[PDB]
């Protein structure tokens, strides 16, 4: 046998039922098509592992090793690097508990593997960039910022590996705030000099910068952490506290108000005093006072833990403490819902940038409507192999229509045009596979705004292809090929 | 406070007349702190014998304790 | 990813201290700020979580 | 939950819900804005001396 | 004199005060009052409620379910 | 609390008849209640004619009485 | 509980029947903590009268009944 | 700033709509938390158009719905 | 912390808060005595912090080389 | 209580407890949905700047 699968033949619980996800995938309004990208080894795979630990109840990371859920080829496990990009469709709740479908395209951070990132750009509608806090912005992150400017997608930034400033660098809170503010300033300057549009300027106050540590399951925005303070004391407003945290906003404890100037000497900001210093004291109580004042700190946070959890080693105990402190991941859900549009919302510039026929053609507005009815025309760019490697399966978003398994589909190549009908090839779809990383879901009806693997169309496709109805066909043009960064 | 009166009326027989003429006589099993009552083997009219029933917080105009 | 770990010599230095062996940031356009003390003054009994807790111990850097 | 905004202690007419109105000398308010009225003759003159009129159903009070 | 103090005095004296419902004069409850709670909940003691005066004994009325008790 | 949990269990196992304060007598499965009696009922026929509602949410001010 | 389920299913199409008899059936724009919530394309049928198609109607707790759609499993809010 | 808009109308006679349906034109001297404002020379129509005048009217906010 | 029992054949076998008992199977300890022992064992211990020092000097590279 | 920012400029029509429905430009509102709506015309009269309370406003919609 060929052991190149990493396949889960069983289906896990994933907390919720399958039919709630099946009802959520009919929307294409609460569905967010987002590519995770960044530099090499920035905890993006461990971040998707943290989302799998949130959603899948029985799937947990081991203490000794960091698992890699998206990396499913054996070559990725051998080399110890992400190689092939992976899509995951999941139901995610925000701080308000509203369920949103997430079509996530986790990509490797390698510029020689940036072709997969360009394919994930062509499928997805939003981009989340991972930044290591100790390292900052490097060459592949710069080139992906340039390609995101060219691809015209909504980009939000999560800053990963924030524990390297703390445990590994031992920075003062003022200097750590200075480094993070300089990181935000250089990202905003790079957006200014690549992007000609300056309405998007990324700030933690504006809901653009999330903070994360994917080896300890830390993910919060200012709104999420002010929601944590609101759940502690509900007298505050978490929206105004997220407005008043970042950016030289100094707390005045005599008036209990907020100024733009420090009221006394060595007065720190609301961001520093309410986020950086208590998290530093939390980690100091972990790594210095694990037996003396750790249950005192646990009761101060309102968390109850058993004795064997306190007898654990420091890193999985700290991961469990941060998981119980921040709950599940909700700031990222608000990040990709409130600041990254739906296929229905942001359909227009992607189909403008991709379709050679444009959005001005009637099939163009049928594309931009994100219609579950109407034409069944799609674009499959990434076209994976299988576990045995004998047969192949396509993968793509559905720009409009509903794919059915057994419903016939004509596939058209890149060289297809209105006089070249030779690239047209008709096959019915064998099965429709909603792609999670280590398992796939057999579904029947796939509407617009949805990512799905296609079985049985693997013959005429070379790299990318367009997907149309074989009968009742109209003037269907060909989407633009994947122009690579390299 | 009516908390000890509700604790006494819990598991005890009484009648309750509502604003809409709903008079229900029977054994109230449990009444909450906001006077959300629950009854067993009661006969109501406004109807017949309902048996196990419940009420809202203040839907009854007057509770005649038997 | 390369381990760049600061190693301390004395416990006189704090556990959150700028090492001069680290190259300085030299950080160099405004911020979207709300009204300063015109709205949303904080209520009574709101506080950071570990404001009573001290910053660091001598065994903190040991850990 | 508060007292009435008239302190009251005068010959005044209080109208309840449904327009039922009495007139008499007020004595004092309550936490539910309930007024005790002395010689509360119903101006629609039934008075029983000590009339405990509830502010939950009381709608208006004019001198 | 506060109305809560007047209701407590009427409950202590158990006077046969004519009491109506919350803006509803269909039942005029005249009779002794056993006691009053802190949330103005009234307990009657064989108060005849004329519609058909039928005194029953211990009857509990809510704090805002009575409008005029004189 | 416990009585509301027992009423929700009886509504899940049988057909509970809740007569709300909007004259809505609904026989069916009351899915959940609340501390403010925000009641959600799943697949209940309500008479205002017992028209079936697949999921009905009602407030505690608009509810009056329940029965198993 | 029920407010959290309404906030979760506050994008689908539901009917809100008020205490005044106004039945606004349409897509939910947003559900607040209170009963004052904004709806989208609601055909508010009046009491024994016709409907009015309002693209933005904000509700007080006058909205009594809420006929919810089938976009809510048994363990979706449990 | 609705409280400021209500406070800017103090010392003048304005018309208000009642919960029953009446229209009352009057001038207030002070206001309360539950809209139980003390008003002088208030003429209330009693939902029939017959304006009757009263003084020192501490009419509660359950009676008065809005402005008219 | 290591001042008493550092030279015993069974150092902390008596202590129930550290070991399971007389079988001497599993140890559960405190941070300052690992700090003291980590300071004391500096001669035998290495100073490397990552496997990136072992670039092609690793076991997979040696298996490839053979 | 949170619908004031959506109708802080556009006109809205709300029905009070009297049954009168007034359409006007909501300029300000209170925390208990007591919305001061300037230039309110009730269906026919004019109420001016009318502060319609949250309990009074049983039904409302966006007119302008
Ligand atoms: N110090 C530190 N390391 C982390 C953190 N989060 C993740 N890592 C480590 O970073 C390593 C590499 O990141 P991956 O999880 O493989 O994600 P990735 O960025 O997609 O990796 P590539 O595909 O190579 O780009 C993981 O094995 C983790 O051990 C963190 O918060 N702090
Ligand atoms: Mg990776």
Swiss-Prot record, chain C:
Taxonomy, superkingdom: Eukaryota
Quaternary structure (record): Part of the U5 snRNP complex. Component of the U4/U6-U5 tri-snRNP complex composed of the U4, U6 and U5 snRNAs and at least PRPF3, PRPF4, PRPF6, PRPF8, PRPF31, SNRNP200, TXNL4A, SNRNP40, DDX23, CD2BP2, PPIH, SNU13, EFTUD2, SART1 and USP39. Component of the U5.U4atac/U6atac snRNP complexes in U12-dependent spliceosomes. Within the minor spliceosome, which acts on U12-type introns, interacts with PPIL2 and RBM48. Core component of U2-type precatalytic, catalytic and postcatalytic spliceosomal complexes. Found in a mRNA splicing-dependent exon junction complex (EJC) with SRRM1.
Protein's recorded name: Pre-mRNA-processing-splicing factor 8
Tissue expr: Widely expressed.
Shown residues in whole-protein numbering: 335 to 401 of 2335
Organism, scientific name: Homo sapiens
Disease in which the protein is involved: Retinitis pigmentosa 13: A retinal dystrophy belonging to the group of pigmentary retinopathies. Retinitis pigmentosa is characterized by retinal pigment deposits visible on fundus examination and primary loss of rod photoreceptor cells followed by secondary loss of cone photoreceptors. Patients typically have night vision blindness and loss of midperipheral visual field. As their condition progresses, they lose their far peripheral visual field and eventually central vision as well.
Subcellular location: Nucleus; Nucleus speckle
Curated annotation (Swiss-Prot), chain E:
One GO CC term, this protein: small nuclear ribonucleoprotein complex
GO molecular function, one term: RNA binding
Annotated localization: Cytoplasm, Cytosol; Nucleus
Tissue specificity annotation: Widely expressed. In scalp skin, it is present in the hair follicle, the epidermis, and the dermis.
Any one Gene Ontology BP term: spliceosomal complex assembly
Annotated S-S bridges: none
Domain Sm: 4-70
Keyword annotations from UniProtKB, A to Z: Cytoplasm, Disease variant, Hypotrichosis, mRNA processing, mRNA splicing, Nucleus, Ribonucleoprotein, RNA-binding, Spliceosome
More info: Patients with systemic lupus erythematosus produce antibodies which interact with snRNP proteins.
Functional description taken from the UniProt entry: Plays a role in pre-mRNA splicing as a core component of the spliceosomal U1, U2, U4 and U5 small nuclear ribonucleoproteins (snRNPs), the building blocks of the spliceosome. Component of both the pre-catalytic spliceosome B complex and activated spliceosome C complexes. As a component of the minor spliceosome, involved in the splicing of U12-type introns in pre-mRNAs. As part of the U7 snRNP it is involved in histone 3'-end processing.
Family: Belongs to the snRNP Sm proteins family.
Name the UniProt record assigns to this protein: Small nuclear ribonucleoprotein E
Entire-sequence positions represented here: 15 to 88 of 92
Curated annotation (Swiss-Prot), chain F:
Keyword Protein biosynthesis (UniProt): no
Subcellular location: Cytoplasm, Cytosol; Nucleus
Domain Sm: 3-68
Annotated GO biological process: 7-methylguanosine cap hypermethylation; mRNA splicing, via spliceosome; RNA splicing; spliceosomal complex assembly; spliceosomal snRNP assembly; U2-type prespliceosome assembly
Entry GO MF terms: RNA binding
GO cellular component, one term: U2-type spliceosomal complex
Keywords associated with the record: Acetylation, Cytoplasm, Isopeptide bond, mRNA processing, mRNA splicing, Nucleus, Phosphoprotein, Ribonucleoprotein, Spliceosome, Ubl conjugation
Its biological purpose: Plays a role in pre-mRNA splicing as a core component of the spliceosomal U1, U2, U4 and U5 small nuclear ribonucleoproteins (snRNPs), the building blocks of the spliceosome. Component of both the pre-catalytic spliceosome B complex and activated spliceosome C complexes. As a component of the minor spliceosome, involved in the splicing of U12-type introns in pre-mRNAs.
Miscellaneous comment as given in the Swiss-Prot or TrEMBL entry: In the autoimmune disease systemic lupus erythematosus, antinuclear antibodies are developed with Sm specificity.
Record-stated family: Belongs to the snRNP core protein family.
Protein name: Small nuclear ribonucleoprotein Sm D2
Organism this protein belongs to: Homo sapiens
UniProtKB/Swiss-Prot annotation, chain H:
Keyword Transferase part of the UniProt annotation: no
An example Gene Ontology biological process: RNA splicing
Compartments reported by the entry: Cytoplasm, Cytosol; Nucleus
Post-translational modification comment from the UniProt entry: Methylated on arginine residues by PRMT5 and PRMT7; probable asymmetric dimethylation which is required for assembly and biogenesis of snRNPs.
Domain Sm intervals: 1-68
Keywords recorded for this protein, A-Z: Acetylation, Cytoplasm, Methylation, mRNA processing, mRNA splicing, Nucleus, Repeat, Ribonucleoprotein, RNA-binding, Spliceosome
Coiled-coil blocks: none
Organism superkingdom: Eukaryota
Main location: cytoplasm
This protein's GO CC annotations: catalytic step 2 spliceosome; commitment complex; cytosol; methylosome; nuclear body; nucleoplasm; nucleus; pICln-Sm protein complex
MF terms (GO), sorted A to Z: enzyme binding; histone pre-mRNA DCP binding; RNA binding; telomerase RNA binding; U7 snRNA binding
Subunit (UniProt): Core component of the spliceosomal U1, U2, U4 and U5 small nuclear ribonucleoproteins (snRNPs), the building blocks of the spliceosome. Most spliceosomal snRNPs contain a common set of Sm proteins, SNRPB, SNRPD1, SNRPD2, SNRPD3, SNRPE, SNRPF and SNRPG that assemble in a heptameric protein ring on the Sm site of the small nuclear RNA to form the core snRNP. Component of the U1 snRNP. The U1 snRNP is composed of the U1 snRNA and the 7 core Sm proteins SNRPB, SNRPD1, SNRPD2, SNRPD3, SNRPE, SNRPF and SNRPG, and at least three U1 snRNP-specific proteins SNRNP70/U1-70K, SNRPA/U1-A and SNRPC/U1-C.
Family: Belongs to the snRNP core protein family.
Descriptive protein name: Small nuclear ribonucleoprotein Sm D3
